[PDB]
């Protein structure tokens, strides 16, 4: 149950820092703010590392063996991670702002640019155990005068080429014996050297600067002493160079400028191979594959990530996230993609397993407040601040209905009928609940009776009653259908935000501004029980506020809650950085998760460092934005009293940490929470956490495989269930033969039935034994499918992942073979004569 680990981070493909490819250019490592996401683009799946920096990260590398990673944030706090175990080895604090870190090609060293010092360290072994201090220093080189902007190793790990903000670029040798091979600096530039690269045979050096020159350096005579033989210029006037890379095997210089435009050149010739644009924001990052066939770009401002093959001109992916803007989320009816409604006005359908956005929808002129699915995965209704509830058909990707009121008010919550006849939506400035029909697009009625803004709505999925809840401390139950027109008010203690309905529609749990969760029966409208939830909340102290976190009244309540799909738990979160999940029958806290440990966000620390408080204000309230290098981020475009508007540059304050919507997954034991860093996705995996179920002294792994070898298959399977080890359940499940699948499946006891159903679900999504798993499913449903029917909500998140296996892999396979059957029949039954 309650041992949810951090699994994934949907949204925000890229935030800040350098993009890296793997050695086999399959995965790309992209910095989300303090995490690191790894997208495998071939096996279409993705994860996010569980470790966390205290600030937004700025530099990334992993060595060519793919075996260990090092990530540095924007004040030098590096973290070294064992890659294939996903578990952090060491934390090392370089003391100052590190521009780039880079491993060696041969792997044994790395080198990083900390200010004006190039410092070369030697890599620890992955198979050596942990030490107190595994990093051994090779050298620290100081030749530069201002900060270093880049590193480039040679092909053989012998020389290292650093580019400085001071207008030169130096070449350094690794060992002391070749000091006289690398003693030259490369002057001649007008602005910041943004890159310095070797050619393939290391007999040319190309040095590209900020203003748009690229110099070619060769070892000739006018002895031989590293002349510059040629200068090429990009001639981009208002734009200037932001990130360069060079793949020397295929001779490819990729440059990304400060106007979105990337041009890529073939370098000793300097011929424009291609030139196009990511967008309008500057291109902060370029990286190239190891074969040089893929290029990955990143623009930090809208947070967008490209990888683009350039031989074929075709975007491998062109994605874009959302920082500090997600007003809601909703899982699909098969919990395979999350639909996210975001403040810049758009809906995005994020695939979960591969972390990329499938479709996006922008027909709202202003911010979208709420998204909710309907008609079982066909339509998706969304209500917005421009005064529209509009329906989206996810089959033809169209907006087929737009519902407006006659009053032009901005809707802040919506709720759809089960059989999607009726859509209701409630505002934060009108006190009515607008009820439109979906077939005829008209306004069916307007339910009045609240005396405060309708904060949250829901429709009961079974008996179709409408539970609304508003800031007049009142929840209110409307029987709309069938001659009644009945209203039932329930008073509560303080003003309700976040109502959620039980899955079977018997009960409804509200959150209140006291920070309590009150669970009401609907039919006899009494309080079945409350949870006191204001002391188990982590409310941080902001940098600008003058009152402690113990005394702050800002975020000690939950503004969004969701029941579990069996109806026994509640996940909840708000404008604080703790998401808490409770179980309702005992009314106790199961677990409380910290949504972020970033200090670049605001409401994180409860206790701020008193070294930053000075004799005039904190030191994180001084705007050091006039010390910036260039005008486009020296500009202060933050018009004054703006909270939650648009465009994060127009706010002047650090982004607060907050959760706007939580959801339990309809198929597999997970929840998702829409934080500011992204859609945090938490789930339990059962490869770890030995959690047996009434075993005894004689039930063992060896005893299970002995009963399997002496082929009592029912005994072996229920011994595997009692151990509750997933590899044992898998091993016995594949050792049972097909003739006595239906005997075993009829004789599994009634308590181990949801175990085998959820195992077959989360196994058969990915495993290749399609006919075996459908044999098991047919045996189990024919054997005990009356028990499932009458214990519906027990098997409601296990049977719903079974028909995420049937309709999404098995029915697709059947569609392909049915196409082959009818093409065969037509191609051999007719007459193609002349």
């Amino acid at each position: 149950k309650s041992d949810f680990k951090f699994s994934n981070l949907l949204g925000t493909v890229y935030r800040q820092g350098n993009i890296t490819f793997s050695d086999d250019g399959k995965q790309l490592l992209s910095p989300v703010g303090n995490r690191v996401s790894v997208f495998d683009l071939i096996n279409n799946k993705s994860f996010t590392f569980e470790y966390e920096h205290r600030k937004n990260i700025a530099a990334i590398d992993l060595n060519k063996q793919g075996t260990l990673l090092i990530s540095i944030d924007e004040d030098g706090r590096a973290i070294l991670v064992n890659f294939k175990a996903r578990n952090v080895l060491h934390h090392f604090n370089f003391k100052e702002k590190c521009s780039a870190v880079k491993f060696s090609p041969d792997g044994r060293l790395f080198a990083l640019a900390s200010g004006r010092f190039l410092q070369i360290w030697k890599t620890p072994d992955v198979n050596k155990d942990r030490q107190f201090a595994p990093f051994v220093r090779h050298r620290v080189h100081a030749g530069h005068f201002q900060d270093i902007t880049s590193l480039t190793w040679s092909q053989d790990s012998r020389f290292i080429l650093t580019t400085s903000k001071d207008l030169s670029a130096k070449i350094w040798s690794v060992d002391s014996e070749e000091k006289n091979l690398a003693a030259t600096t490369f002057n001649g530039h007008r602005d910041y050297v943004m890159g310095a690269f070797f050619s393939h045979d290391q007999e040319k050096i190309y040095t590209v600067s900020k203003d748009g020159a690229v110099f070619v350096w060769e070892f000739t005579k006018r002895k031989y002493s590293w002349r510059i033989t040629k200068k090429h210029f990009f001639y981009a006037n208002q734009a200037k160079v932001k990130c360069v890379t060079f793949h020397p095997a295929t001779r490819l210089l990729a440059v990304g400028f400060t106007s979105g435009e990337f041009r890529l050149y073939d370098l000793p010739d300097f011929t424009l191979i291609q030139q196009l644009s990511m967008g309008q924001n500057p291109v902060n990052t370029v990286s190239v594959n190891q074969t040089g066939e893929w290029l990955a770009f990143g623009s930090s401002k809208l947070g967008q990530l490209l990888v683009y093959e350039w031989q074929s001109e075709s975007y491998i992916l062109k994605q874009q996230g959302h920082f500090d803007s997600t007003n809601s989320l909703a899982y699909s009816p098969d919990g395979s993609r999350v639909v996210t409604a975001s403040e810049d006005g758009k809906i995005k359908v994020w695939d979960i397993t591969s972390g990329f956005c499938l479709a996006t929808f922008e027909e709202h002129t202003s911010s979208v407040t709420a998204v909710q699915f309907a008609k079982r995965g066909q339509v998706m209704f969304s209500s917005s601040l421009d005064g529209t509830v509009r329906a989206w058909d996810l089959i033809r990707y169209r907006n087929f209905r737009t519902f407006t009121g006659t009053e032009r008010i901005q809707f802040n919550c919506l709720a759809v009928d089960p059989s999607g006849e009726v859509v209701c939506a409630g505002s934060l400035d009108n006190f009515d609940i607008h009820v439109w029909s979906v077939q005829t697009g008209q306004l069916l009625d307007a339910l009045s009776g609240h005396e405060g803004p309708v904060s949250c709505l829901s429709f009961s999925q079974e008996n179709s009653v409408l539970a609304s809840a508003s800031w007049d401390k009142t929840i209110r139950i409307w029987s709309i259908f069938g001659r009644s027109q009945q209203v039932e008010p329930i008073e509560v203690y303080s003003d309700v935000l976040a109502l959620s309905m039980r899955p079977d529609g018997k009960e409804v749990a509200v959150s209140t501004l006291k920070g309590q969760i009150s669970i009401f029966n609907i039919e006899d409208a009494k309080q079945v029980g409350n949870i006191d939830c204001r002391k188990d909340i982590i409310s941080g102290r902001f940098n600008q506020d003058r009152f402690t976190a113990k005394n702050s009244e800002r975020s000690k309540f939950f503004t969004t809650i969701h029941y579990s799909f069996d109806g026994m738990a509640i996940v909840a979160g708000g404008n604080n950085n703790s998401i808490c999940l409770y179980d309702v029958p005992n009314e106790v806290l199961l677990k409380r998760f910290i949504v972020s440990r970033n200090m670049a966000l605001n409401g994180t620390l409860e206790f701020l460092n008193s070294k930053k408080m000075t004799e005039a204000g904190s030191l994180d309230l001084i705007d050091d934005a006039g010390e910036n290098s260039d005008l486009e981020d020296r500009i202060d475009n933050s018009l004054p009293g703006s909270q939650r508007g648009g465009d994060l540059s127009t706010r002047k304050m650090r982004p607060e940490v907050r959760v706007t919507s939580v959801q339990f997954s309809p198929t597999a034991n997970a929840f998702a929470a829409a934080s500011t860093e992204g859609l945090l996705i938490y789930s339990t995996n059962d490869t770890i956490l030995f959690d047996p179920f009434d075993l005894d002294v004689d039930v063992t792994p060896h005893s299970t495989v002995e009963a399997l070898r002496e082929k009592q298959f029912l005994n072996a399977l229920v011994m595997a269930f009692r151990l509750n080890e997933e590899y044992l359940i898998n091993k016995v499940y594949e050792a049972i033969p097909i003739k006595e699948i239906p005997l075993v499946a009829s004789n599994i006891p009634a308590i181990y039935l949801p175990r085998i159903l959820k195992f077959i679900g989360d196994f058969a999504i990915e495993s290749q034994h399609i006919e075996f798993n459908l044999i098991w499913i047919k045996a189990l449903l024919s054997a005990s499918g009356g028990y499932i029917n009458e214990h519906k909500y027990l098997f409601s998140t296990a049977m719903r992942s079974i028909q995420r296996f049937i309709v999404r892999v098995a029915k697709e396979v059947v569609n392909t073979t049915t196409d082959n059957k009818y093409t065969y029949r037509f191609l051999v039954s007719t007459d193609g004569s002349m």
């Binding site: 071939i42 893929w294 093959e309 031989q311 075709s314």
Partner: protein, 171 residues
Amino acid sequence: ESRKIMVPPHRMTPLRNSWTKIYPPLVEHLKLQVRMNLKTKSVELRTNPKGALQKGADFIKAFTLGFDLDDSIALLRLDDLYIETFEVKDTGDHLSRAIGRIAGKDGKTKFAIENATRTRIVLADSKIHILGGFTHIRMARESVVSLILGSPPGKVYGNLRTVASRLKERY
């Protein structure tokens, strides 16, 4: 050791005026010695005492086959290049319009084949020679054969577009 290469009676005066751009990759780049024997209308490439001769002879054979100087030098460098010669062989019907079906109006079908699969095709009256990479030659040859043996031009043009994309694609 030596190689002889004949010069056909349609590529002798272009060879003569562009001879000054032919011999230095035979002499200072590759280290052979050369002489154009006007008597037997050929060229003798010998080695000196100060395996290059096959690549030099292939560069000269490209020039005598009728690829220009730059495409002959593209075969000279770029060791992953080949060149495939085939006659039609597969007169009013089968010959007087098959090579017009290859070339098309103003050479645009041959040009579309060339650009789609990144080869260079020189077309004689009935002798087709294809310069390029291996899979490039493969798809060019399949296209040429498809419309000498009779296919819709819409079919072979769609196949050229698909072949261009899938030849440039990774994975």
